[PDB]
Design a protein around this nucleic acid. Structure first.
Ligand SMILES: *P(=O)(O)OC[C@@H](CO)CCn1cnc2c(=O)nc(N)[nH]c21
Ligand SMILES: [Mg+2]
Ligand SMILES: [Mg+2]
Ligand SMILES: [Mg+2]
Ligand SMILES: [Mg+2]
Ligand SMILES: [Zn+2]
Ligand SMILES: [Zn+2]
Lengths: 155, 925, 69, 174
RNA sequence: CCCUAUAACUUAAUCUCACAUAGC
RNA sequence: GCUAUGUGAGAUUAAGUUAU
């Protein structure tokens, strides 16, 4: 009786082969899901560091002593957001579409906007080339690449 | 002549009889009427009175009128008694009572003196029922009160808010006169209370100087206890208050137009007592309680009623007070600036509950809501003054201004010369090329953003809006909704953008993998108690079009998108899954879906015509009241899973995220006035709610503006009576009449809705009598509620239902014989299909051997052109077939000549035989 | 006849975009204005008129050599 | 198909066909079935890889030669357009006569053309008007590369080597 | 370097389920 | 109970097209 002996042996190899296939597949899905999970937590650490350094540079960019004054003068320490750059921003950028807007808005080295004195520092055009203040004129207006961007400082 | 001097009285004046003889004259005026038999705000013929024109001592006819009232005898004793109890008030007009012999009999006359020609009801009717070519009363009022002289009217489209924005200045010249009328009405109400007089105040009893008369229905009571009903007066007047900008004097010192403006404190944001004082001054006798902050409201109906007053009173206050309310927060001992609140134009002041002054560290959720917050980006950016736009500019993030352009399209030359070799693009052909990629310069993105000047603050008729919202809710009652957890969320695309500032670090997959399900549920529970303002980024769209206008698309950040998915997805999926409903989002046009949609929209209408309208500048000019209404309609599915303050904070998050959010447009933060954001998850559904709302209020305005005597059907007359009752008299929801009016609308005004595009099948006989809405009713409703002029060149009608709708989702319809029956098939414009083939947005699509899959889709979309009578239209489908076969042969040749073993290329001959495309339109899927 | 003008317009503007005309904003604005008008033109008498201007923008640059063609 | 030995074995087992080699043709049929299925899988993924490398090769060829193919395509259909207004400014740019700015569509507007030799001048100009882009234009001046204003009488047949050859004509439209 | 949302359809490749066939 | 071959259904991913 050896035919039924290799019958029992082949049934045993069929059992262990089915378990072999499912456990190798199991190690496959386990190792690729831990690939996914390990790289995903690495992504989470990278995004945490990136958002943290973004907020940490952004706090250092804002000038606090002009800000703490208008916050402490508030009745509860709560102010609108629309007045924070209106009152505590050192720089002002003005985008000016043509010359008729320019001669009204910023004519001269110093203009007044939002109850403050602004000293014009630099003027660039839409190609971002430095435009002199002598170049902005009514007869030289078709040679300029409009709009002009005027960056000023708080006087 | 003896009657004319009798009318002059003790006061000295010069008169001219408008009517002939001693008889009366008929005038066509508008009346707010409500009887036992008739109701509505319509134009009736006035027969009771006789009016005398006054003229100055330099002999030209002036606005003062002497109008005598010939009525019954018992009305004379009653009117005279009421007048003698109110005579001391300066709000009442002067009344001279007498009896003058007409035909041998003494007939009592009531002469009302120094009246204008038109009442307030004539102004409200002329502005709420606007029809160009039939607008002589509005022109006469505008000429009379120095808003504009007569040749201003000569200019074409003088009335259009888009083609002529000076009409807002012309209409705002009537604001001071309207404000005076409101003050006089308050004075008259106080005099009625002190004189113990009760009664309804209507618009046709007050002339344009603000003086009151017609004490016909007034009845006396204990002095000091008189209640006057002003619900109908104020609610009918409410759109005129913002169209004419009546409260513009309130921003000046002492409310005088010559004084300078009030300079408020820049730190001030509350304005609660100022709103209460405005309400107490102008709407003192309004019985419903007004909450200045809508966090204290009782349901969504109260939220709508109080937000309608907030949109009027917010036009007085300075625009720097609205928006996020920021506070100093200490993380790690380092001060932050985070937004711990929000001051809404519509919802008042909203304060975040879960704030912490000091935080030892920041959780991924805390970092996520601090990065999405515009407070840190605006508090560190430069100040910005942008003169290119009229919208409010907040801050410049970058030291430079970004100018992005749109490239031209890439030309597919092979398909074009293959098409012209087959006979296309000849002279005089019905098939042209009209859809191209239009290039844009660097100033295109900020000039697209300057179309939000078409959004104006709009006060609504609150009574008809409250009734209209109940009717609109019935349309969406079949669907099921509510909140779902984060594991039940189905995202279509995870490799799209994450918005600003989250696009710096990765896509949406990064934030859906970095966040656990516990983190997403904690973020949703955080938005149920707090308001997170977010930044929406505007990007120009590179797509083929037939118009040279640029198109921008709003990109909402991943925080708002992630939370709004958990709030709205169960309802949105339910709407898409449903078939055979009014809103047809999610219904395929293939496999017979177009025929089933057309059969469903026809339903069972007795005298059926077809009608389709247009919304000019739909997303730009959509008012915030209708957007909040649409959010409340979609939020009404949360009765079990949410409390009322949870639903309020979700509404406030929706407002601060997609209605009045900070918009980044080229490295610069701007304030968005309002309108719909395409990037928002619920934009398509909310536009469907808005479309159904505008159609229902067009039907309500059509049914109330008709003469109730001329309605022969008794059911429609009783329906009009109960309609006026449930709008203006009843204050609670009458669900039986809401069901009856909804059944009337489903029977006579059958609509198919998909986003902002809709087609309506309606009873044309009821429209020719005014019982359902028409094109003119839609134009009037879009005039006073949307602030746009809907021209009739963009609307269509169809009297023959064997032809389908004229256009739906930019598809036409033909009745063709498929098998043994006749079905409706959609076909597109052949220029659109040809344009996609001849031009592409990538150089990779210019060869065809890589892009055979592209021409198969174009062929599938252009199959029903073969059933067209035009041979040229029919030829477009064959051309795509022969080109697909040519691409197959060129692919075979090139892949053979480069690699010596031949590709077997299996199951590819189906692509150039029309049975594969004929199967896409037969009903068996 | 009109369609050849419109397709040559889009080919010319994509060539000009390849030659970095949009580094100067004013010339790129003039080019886009000419390109949009040719596409929306309803007659070929004045569509060739704008084509001379748009081709002269290319011919004024020496990034291409037309002596080869 | 005929390229198997397993097909020859199964065909031999079937042409032998009672029930005892029926078992043989059944197991050989399972053999030939799995063999033909594996050959179909190999042909499947071979077609997949061949068409994928074809897609990436043709796409990178397109992205590589986009600019030269676009410059070549443009003068193919400009030549096809058959326009003497367009052919005037192409042949002039061929022989060297290129404008400095945009040709204006409007009348009375400045135009800056460059003429580098005398034959280009005489085949364009005759008198005070000169023809360019199928239009008559009014000469306002002509200035030099050495920046001095020359009037029309100064340039001629003999003294054309005398002056500097880039001549910049300022022109207004008729 | 930027490129939205939703819906429908087409193609491709996988993975499960059901059915028919043949061997142990 | 197992193995292999085909035929359909559903799900996931990728690419594309149209509509709003
Ligand atoms: P339709 O194009 O006529 O729709 C009008 C429209 C406003 O732009 C609102 C529909 N809508 C909303 N969001 C959209 C988007 O992202 N894309 C498109 N094509 N339409 C949108
Ligand atoms: Mg009256
Ligand atoms: Mg009366
Ligand atoms: Mg629209
Ligand atoms: Mg549309
Ligand atoms: Zn309330
Ligand atoms: Zn809920």
């Amino acid at each position: 009786k050896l035919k039924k002996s290799l019958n029992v042996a082949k049934s045993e190899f069929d059992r262990d082969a089915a378990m072999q296939r499912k456990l190798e597949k199991m190690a496959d899905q386990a190792m690729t899901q831990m690939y996914k999970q390990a790289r995903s937590e690495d992504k989470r650490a990278k995004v945490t560091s990136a958002m943290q350094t973004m907020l940490f540079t952004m706090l250092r960019k804002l000038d606090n002593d002009a800000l703490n004054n208008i916050i402490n003068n508030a009745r509860d320490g709560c102010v609108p957001l629309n007045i924070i750059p209106l009152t505590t921003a050192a720089k002002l950028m003005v985008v000016i579409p043509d010359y008729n807007t320019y001669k009204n808005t910023c004519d001269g080295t110093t203009f007044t906007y939002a109850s403050a004195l602004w000293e014009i520092q630099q003027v660039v055009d839409a190609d971002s080339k430095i435009v002199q203040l002598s170049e902005i004129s009514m007869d030289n207006s078709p040679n300029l690449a409009w709009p002009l961007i005027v960056t000023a400082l708080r006087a | 002549q003896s009657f004319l001097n009798r009318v002059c009285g003790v006061s000295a004046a010069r008169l001219t009889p408008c009517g002939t003889g001693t008889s009366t004259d008929v005038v066509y005026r508008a009346f707010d009427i409500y009887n036992d038999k008739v109701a509505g705000f319509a134009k009736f013929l006035k027969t009771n009175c006789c009016r005398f024109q006054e003229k100055d001592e330099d002999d030209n006819l002036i606005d003062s009128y002497f109008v005598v009232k010939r009525h019954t005898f018992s009305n004379y004793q009653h009117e005279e008694t009421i007048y003698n109890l109110l005579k001391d008030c300066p709000a009442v007009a002067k009344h001279d009572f007498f009896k003058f012999r007409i035909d041998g009999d003494m007939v009592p006359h009531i002469s009302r003196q120094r009246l204008t020609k038109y009442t307030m009801a004539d102004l409200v009717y002329a502005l709420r029922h606007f029809d160009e070519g039939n607008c002589d009363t509005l022109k006469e009022i505008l000429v009379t009160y120095n808003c504009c002289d007569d040749d201003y009217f000569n200019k074409k489209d003088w009335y259009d808010f888009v083609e002529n924005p000076d009409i807002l200045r012309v209409y705002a010249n009537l604001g001071e006169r309207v404000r005076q009328a409101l003050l006089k009405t308050v004075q008259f109400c106080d005099a009625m209370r002190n004189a113990g007089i009760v009664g309804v105040l209507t618009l046709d009893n007050q002339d344009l100087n603000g003086n009151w008369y017609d004490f016909g229905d007034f009845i006396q009571t204990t002095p000091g206890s008189g209640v006057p009903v002003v619900d109908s007066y104020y609610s009918l007047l409410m759109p005129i208050l913002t169209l004419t900008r009546a409260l513009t004097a309130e921003s000046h010192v002492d409310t005088d137009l010559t004084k300078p403006y009030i300079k408020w404190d820049l730190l001030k944001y509350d304005f609660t007592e100022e709103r209460l004082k405005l309400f107490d001054r102008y709407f003192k006798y309004w019985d419903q309680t007004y909450h200045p902050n809508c966090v204290n409201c009782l349901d969504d109906r109260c939220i709508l009623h109080c937000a309608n007053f907030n949109v009027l009173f917010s036009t007085v206050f300075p625009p720097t007070s609205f928006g996020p309310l920021v506070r100093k927060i200490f993380v790690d001992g380092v001060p932050f600036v985070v937004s711990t609140g929000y001051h809404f134009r519509e919802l008042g002041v909203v304060h975040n509950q879960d704030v912490n002054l000091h935080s030892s560290r920041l959780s991924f959720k805390e970092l996520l809501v601090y990065a999405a917050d515009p407070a840190m980006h605006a508090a560190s950016g430069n100040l910005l003054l942008d003169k290119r736009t009229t919208c409010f500019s907040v801050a410049a993030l970058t030291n430079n201004v970004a100018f992005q352009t749109v490239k031209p399209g890439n030309f597919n030359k092979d398909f074009y010369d293959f098409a012209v070799s087959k006979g296309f693009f000849k002279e005089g052909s019905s098939v042209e090329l009209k859809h191209f990629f239009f290039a844009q310069d660097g100033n295109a993105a900020i000039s697209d953003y300057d179309y939000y000047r078409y959004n104006l603050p709009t006060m609504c008729d609150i009574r008809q809006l409250l009734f209209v919202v109940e009717v609109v809710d019935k349309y969406f009652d079949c669907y099921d909704g509510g909140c779902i957890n984060a594991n039940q969320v189905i995202v279509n695309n995870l490799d799209k953008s994450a918005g600003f500032p989250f696009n710096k670090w990765g896509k949406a997959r990064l934030y859906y993998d970095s966040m656990s399900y516990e983190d997403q549920d904690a973020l949703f529970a955080y938005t149920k108690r707090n308001v997170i303002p977010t930044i929406t980024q505007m990007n120009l769209k590179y797509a083929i079009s037939a118009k040279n206008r640029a198109r921008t698309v709003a990109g909402v950040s991943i925080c708002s998108t992630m939370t709004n998915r958990q709030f709205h997805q169960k309802l949105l999926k339910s709407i898409a899954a449903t078939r055979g409903a009014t809103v047809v989002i999610g219904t395929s046009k293939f496999y017979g879906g177009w025929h089933n949609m057309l059969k469903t929209v026809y339903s069972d209408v007795e005298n059926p015509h077809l009608m389709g309208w247009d919304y000019p500048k739909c997303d730009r000019a959509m008012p915030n009241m209708l957007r909040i209404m649409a959010s409340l309609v979609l939020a009404r599915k949360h009765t079990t899973c949410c409390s009322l303050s949870h639903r309020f904070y979700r509404l406030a998050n929706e407002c601060a995220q997609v209605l009045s959010e900070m918009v980044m447009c080229g490295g610069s933060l701007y304030v968005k006035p309002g309108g719909t954001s395409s990037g928002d998850a619920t934009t398509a559904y909310a536009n469907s709610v808005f479309n159904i709302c505008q159609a229902v209020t067009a039907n309500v305005n059509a049914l109330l503006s008709t003469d109730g005597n001329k309605i022969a059907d008794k059911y429609v007359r009783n329906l009009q009576h109960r309609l006026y009752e449930c709008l203006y008299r009843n204050r609670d929801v009458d669900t039986d009449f809401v069901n009856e009016f909804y059944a009337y609308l489903r029977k006579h005004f059958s609509m198919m809705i998909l986003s902002d595009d809709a087609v309506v099948c309606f009873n044309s006989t009821y429209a020719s009598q005014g019982l359902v809405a028409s094109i003119k009713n839609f134009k009037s409703v879009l005039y006073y509620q949307n602030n746009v002029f809907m021209s009739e060149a963009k609307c269509w009608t169809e009297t023959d239902l064997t032809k389908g709708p004229h256009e739906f989702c930019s598809q036409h319809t033909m009745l063709v014989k498929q098998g043994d029956d006749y079905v409706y098939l959609p076909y597109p414009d052949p220029s659109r299909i040809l344009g996609a083939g001849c031009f592409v947005d990538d150089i990779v699509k210019t060869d065809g051997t890589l892009m055979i899959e592209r021409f198969v889709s174009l062929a599938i979309d252009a199959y029903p052109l073969t059933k067209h009578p035009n041979q040229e239209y029919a030829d477009v489908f064959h051309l795509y077939l022969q080109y697909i076969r040519k691409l197959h042969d060129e692919l075979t040749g090139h892949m053979l000549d480069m690699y010596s073993v031949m590709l077997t290329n299996d199951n590819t001959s189906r692509y150039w035989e029309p049975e594969f495309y004929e199967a896409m339109y037969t009903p068996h899927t | 006849k009109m369609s050849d003008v419109k397709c040559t317009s889009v080919v010319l503007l994509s060539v000009l975009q390849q030659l970095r005309v949009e580094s100067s904003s004013k010339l790129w604005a003039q080019c886009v204005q000419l390109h949009n008008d040719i596409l929306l033109a309803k007659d070929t008498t004045e569509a060739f008129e704008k084509m001379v201007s748009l081709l002269s923008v290319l011919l004024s640059m020496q990034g291409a050599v037309d002596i080869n063609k």
